[PDB]
Paper text:
To generate straight, linear THRs, we set Δθ to zero. We tested 33 linear THRs (with Δh = 0) with helices either about 20 or about 40 residues in height; 23 of 33 tested designs were solubly expressed, and 13 of 19 designs analysed by SEC were primarily monomeric as designed. Structural characterization of the linear building blocks by X-ray crystallography individually and/or cryogenic EM (cryo-EM) in the context of assemblies (see below) revealed that both the detailed internal structures and the overall straight linear geometry were successfully achieved.
Here we describe extendable linear, curved and angled protein building blocks, as well as inter-block interactions, that conform to specified geometric standards; assemblies designed using these blocks inherit their extendability and regular interaction surfaces, enabling them to be expanded or contracted by varying the number of modules, and reinforced with secondary struts. We construct twistless helix repeat (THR) protein blocks from identical straight α-helices (typically 2–4 helices in each unit); the length of the blocks can be varied simply by varying the number of repeat units. Restricting helical geometry to ideal straight helices with zero helical twist in principle considerably limits what types of structure could be built, but this is more than compensated by the great simplification of downstream material design, as illustrated below.
Numbering used by the authors:
A (entry chain B): 1 to 201
B (entry chain A): 1 to 199
Amino acid sequence: PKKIVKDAKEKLEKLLEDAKDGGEELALDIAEELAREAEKALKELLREGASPELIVDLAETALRALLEIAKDGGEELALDIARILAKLAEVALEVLLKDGASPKLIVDLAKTALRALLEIAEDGGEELALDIAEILAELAEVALRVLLKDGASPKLIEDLAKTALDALEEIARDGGEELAEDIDRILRKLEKVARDVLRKD
Amino acid sequence: PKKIVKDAKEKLEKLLEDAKDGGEELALDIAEELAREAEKALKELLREGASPELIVDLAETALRALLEIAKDGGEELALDIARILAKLAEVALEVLLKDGASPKLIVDLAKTALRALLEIAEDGGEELALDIAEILAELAEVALRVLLKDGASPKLIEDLAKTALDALEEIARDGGEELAEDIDRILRKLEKVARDVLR
């Protein structure tokens, strides 16, 4: 429980200290080891009956640790970290659903992961921004369907949807016309998914 | 978390074995000691960061333990256990809301408690039935408002409302005409409560 979280954050901080300003090829291996250590600790918290708030805490700590590795590195590494970050965010959201988490805690973790991806796209170039926008939209769809399965209200589902739609618009503001319509098609698909999830609710 | 539940259930079972068919007057004190021990363990699970499923398990175990004391006793004791059972269920529902539980788990615990009260009105007189229904309607309102605070959907909220309204109609069935209109006044007040929460 509380003992599992302390051991996990200690391993994450030590993993984060390594390969940070120490090599791109090593940072990718360290990040995959950081994401695996987080995934095992999340599954461990689920087995031992931990609160959803502890699960959110450990998950957010891991996502921010991956975020720091992606920023100070190249765009090739940033896309690799963002794919790892979104996959870890999926596992954490699935764990919260199995642990019986509230809609609000699912929204919090989802927003933390969406802002982290947005933080990578704004810092990078235009081709990277489109790659992050597609990753962000897929993760947003996963979170919206997790909220639906958890019993969330249309208010919170529409809330998480707007945050993801705003994040996609925020990427297009600092881009050319070619990037705008490449994000506009992503926005229409995410609005379609959000409309379907809300109609079932 | 898992360590707290095992110690609590062992205390509840031993407390239940005592005064089960064992004196009524002691059973009421044992039941108050039973609900007090469960309420302290539920607060303990919240402080140590326990999962909502562990809180539901311990709460349902305590509610059923009270249910056993109420059935093999008299109607006066059955009403006393039902008030204790409803108060404990309210604490457990609030603990679930503070712990970050899902709306489904809140609905599950609420239904367990509403059925436990209905089972006490079962095989009881009409005077006890009306007293149980008033307790059931109040606990139903508590659970519905907790569901709203937890971000529950209209489907889950309307589902819990249907269960509570159906439970009131089951009490009216096989009852006197004087009991039916007494339940009918309770049904209409729970209906507007559900409409206000659903809006």
